């Protein structure tokens, strides 16, 4: 239990242990201890290495709940991301009954958010939101932000370069006390956006920047039968299958369900009500197979994924490393298999091995030992 060295509340440490966390990532070791003191944070870390837990655990530790009073505000760029972030607040405030959280975004009647804000059972101490609706709550005085002590902007580079989101965020930022902690996070903080960020911070802490791999050389007409055989022989907990288009995702998923391989699919061109519903179905282990485009190529963390299959290879090596990264989370065991069915699959597979030193061996025809990836 490495997080207990941060000297956090016993309710926090207990919830962190129920979430499977045992070793803090490097961004959390470099940010959490000094963020607890209320120091402003401008943080950059690579995709999926745990920036959410930084400001979630930090604000939850500084929080002392005052009833009916919003103390923490978190801003992101997308509605489902806000829903995801609020669900992380719920899981770490598991054993803090006094804490109440709410999320707000467009697409829902704003009158119901007003009622939820006044109710004594739902009056939130922590508010996650998208800039548009939260501004529509500040300006119609459905919410009071005169007591905010923690102001968080996630994906701050996108929030502050899009100018309609910047106006809303700055309107929200001017309803808060000036003597608050401000924290910003993004995997990409270019030299051109950092000066814009600094106009919200005051002397901030600035942080800047087991997987077995095989390939199979085959033809496109042989992918369906070889994949079905792979899923019958390999012993996996959950598998993610990456495809290069949405049409190939839906058609492959339809053939998997027809062949007694229960699978779901997530991609663009789909209603977000449906994208999230299947995301939760796969995340909560109702089906062991997920076919998706690069919409799940980065960041997604599902601990039961120990098999990633590149049904279609990527154009460049960087996306490949993020794809196979979905398996073997937190240095656990995993297995990655890529299909090489054309000329660029061979040059991109050729360009992956010099970049990372990995010899992506050809999948042996006799198969592999289950112990070598379990």
């Amino acid at each position: 239990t490495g997080f207990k060295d941060f000297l956090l509340k016993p309710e926090l440490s207990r919830a962190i242990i129920d979430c499977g966390f045992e070793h803090p990532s490097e961004v959390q070791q470099h940010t959490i201890p000094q963020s607890i003191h209320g120091t402003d944070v401008l943080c950059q870390a690579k995709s999926g290495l745990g920036k959410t837990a930084v400001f979630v655990l930090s604000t939850l530790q500084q929080l002392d709940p005052v009833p009916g009073e919003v103390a923490v505000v978190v801003i992101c760029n997308a509605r489902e991301l806000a829903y995801q972030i609020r669900n992380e607040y719920l899981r770490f405030s598991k054993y803090m009954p006094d804490v109440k959280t709410a999320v707000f975004y467009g697409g829902t009647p704003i009158s119901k958010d007003a009622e939820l804000l006044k109710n004594k059972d739902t009056a939130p101490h922590i508010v996650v939101a998208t800039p548009g609706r939260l501004k529509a709550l500040v300006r119609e005085k459905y919410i009071d932000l005169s007591h905010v002590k923690n102001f968080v902007i996630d994906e701050c580079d996108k929030v502050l370069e899009e100018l309609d989101m910047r106006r809303d965020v700055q309107e929200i930022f001017r309803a808060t006390p000036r003597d608050k902690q401000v924290m910003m996070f993004s995997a990409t903080l270019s030299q051109e956006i950092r000066p814009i960020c600094r106009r919200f911070l005051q002397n901030p802490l600035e942080i800047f920047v087991g997987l077995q791999q095989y390939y199979i050389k085959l033809e496109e007409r042989e992918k369906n039968r070889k994949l079905a055989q792979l899923l019958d022989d390999l012993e996996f907990n959950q598998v993610i299958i990456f495809v290069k288009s949405t049409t190939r995702a839906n058609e492959l998923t339809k053939l998997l369900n027809a062949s007694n391989f229960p699978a779901i699919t997530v991609h663009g061109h789909m209603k977000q009500e449906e994208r999230i519903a299947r995301y939760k179905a796969f995340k909560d282990f109702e089906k062991r197979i997920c076919v998706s485009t690069d919409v799940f190529g980065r960041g997604i963390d599902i601990e039961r994924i120990n098999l990633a299959i590149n049904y279609d290879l990527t154009n460049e090596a960087d996306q490949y490393l993020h794809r196979v990264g979905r398996a073997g989370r937190f240095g656990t065991k995993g297995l990655a298999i890529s299909f090489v069915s054309s000329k660029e699959d061979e040059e991109v597979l050729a360009k992956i091995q010099e970049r990372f030193d990995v010899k992506i061996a050809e999948f042996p025809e006799e198969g592999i030992d289950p112990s070598t990836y379990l």
Copy 2:
């Protein structure tokens, strides 16, 4: 026939007259005459003011076809845009039987492009392509670019800032003679991309930078019957109907098709194979009605749209001006009608009129004269 003052081939001028062109836009007046001489061009012009006709008519005038020899190469960033550009070459080479053109992009077997390149009926003098596939044609020597005299990069700022496209484009650019004409076009040429552009030019010519509005105050349950009546009484060529959500787009479009109002819909939550298929169906006048979210609120240019209906009003005035801008393209006649069904429709309609000086009159109960918008 203003284009005849450029002193172009009689076959070109004749095809230009069949395309309805009669007056050159300012970008074409400032670029075409000096581009005909083979002078390098770095051109910036606003969206939709005719940059395609600049390099299309210019290369077609300089072209003297040599059989089996590629003389002109055009690079864009998207596959459908390449298909669109090649179709513009077809329409202006209408009366030039010697000219042959081809387009190449991913998603198709590359062996068939090789066969099309060798065939004496299809060996192209002008090649439009996306950087990925054209590089895969140069490096496997399916195409010969040792004779290119005109090299065009459309949307050059996107082609050269994305680095996988820059590598491919520079690999293609090194298979061409160095003493060729190079032309680049984009609506956005920031100060940061122009030095990168100049490394391909040599002393280039550098060019840098009627709507009737009404509203109807009604209730939400009355929108369907009032819209159906509006589409039966008003005389429009094509109509765009803007909705605030994707669920309301699909349900409204389904009711329109049931009531003998053939319509299509484009929005998020949809497979992009399907989004584009309906975009082309509406753009090519197969159905006169399109229901969409703000995915078509900006930029989209369809000349037959003379009626825009705000079935759901926007949150802020800026998006309203872009929405109604889809009708009456290039200063032609148009008609805009917005539904006011709640309190903010009234304050946002209130805030539109001070910003733009327009008195958006209430739609008269007796209807409006067809002459006032035709």
